[PDB]
Scaffold this active site. Structure first.
Site, PDB file in Angstrom:
ATOM      1  N   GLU A   1     -10.755  15.433  19.829  1.00  0.00           N
ATOM      2  CA  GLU A   1     -10.250  14.702  20.985  1.00  0.00           C
ATOM      3  C   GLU A   1     -11.266  14.713  22.122  1.00  0.00           C
ATOM      4  OE1 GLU A   1      -6.685  16.827  20.908  1.00  0.00           O
ATOM      5  OE2 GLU A   1      -5.358  15.078  20.800  1.00  0.00           O
TER       6      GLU A   1
ATOM      7  N   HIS B   1     -13.046  18.725  21.874  1.00  0.00           N
ATOM      8  CA  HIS B   1     -12.195  19.854  21.512  1.00  0.00           C
ATOM      9  C   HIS B   1     -11.409  19.553  20.239  1.00  0.00           C
ATOM     10  CE1 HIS B   1      -9.936  17.751  25.019  1.00  0.00           C
ATOM     11  NE2 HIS B   1      -9.923  17.000  23.932  1.00  0.00           N
TER      12      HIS B   1
ATOM     13  N   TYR C   1       4.047  13.635  15.608  1.00  0.00           N
ATOM     14  CA  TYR C   1       3.248  13.494  16.820  1.00  0.00           C
ATOM     15  C   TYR C   1       1.847  14.060  16.618  1.00  0.00           C
ATOM     16  CZ  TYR C   1       1.393  14.688  21.422  1.00  0.00           C
ATOM     17  OH  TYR C   1       0.579  14.845  22.520  1.00  0.00           O
TER      18      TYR C   1
ATOM     19  N   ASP D   1      -3.692   8.613  22.568  1.00  0.00           N
ATOM     20  CA  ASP D   1      -4.321   8.098  23.778  1.00  0.00           C
ATOM     21  C   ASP D   1      -5.631   8.827  24.062  1.00  0.00           C
ATOM     22  OD1 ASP D   1      -2.292   6.122  24.981  1.00  0.00           O
ATOM     23  OD2 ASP D   1      -3.526   6.640  26.726  1.00  0.00           O
TER      24      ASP D   1
END
Length: 94
Positions: free
Chosen positions: A32, A40, A78, A83
């Site tokens: 990410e 990370h 999830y 995003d």
């Protein structure tokens, strides 16, 4: 047959990619974007069964782990934030 909960941890500014563990059974992580240009790692990892944080930390000593089951089963959908998702998802092991 007994099931175990996944381990949710966050690695910031990793010195190298993760890998499967002889103790664990499955490995799931993704890259990410955040905290400076650096990247990370974030995902869920399922250990053998009776393996405490000592088992996971042994692979990456110096990260934020949480076995409180903050996403037990929920992380299967999830997982991470799309995003802010950079790479992945990635599956390894069994």
């Amino acid at each position: 047959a007994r099931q175990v909960i996944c381990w949710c941890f966050t690695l910031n500014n990793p010195l190298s990619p993760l890998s499967l563990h002889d103790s664990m059974k499955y490995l799931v992580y993704q890259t990410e974007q955040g905290e400076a240009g650096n990247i990370h790692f974030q995902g869920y990892i399922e250990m053998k069964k009776r393996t405490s944080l000592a088992g996971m930390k042994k692979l990456i000593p110096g990260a934020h782990f949480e076995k409180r089951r903050g996403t037990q089963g929920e992380a299967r959908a999830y997982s991470m934030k799309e995003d802010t998702r950079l790479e992945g998802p990635w599956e390894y092991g069994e």
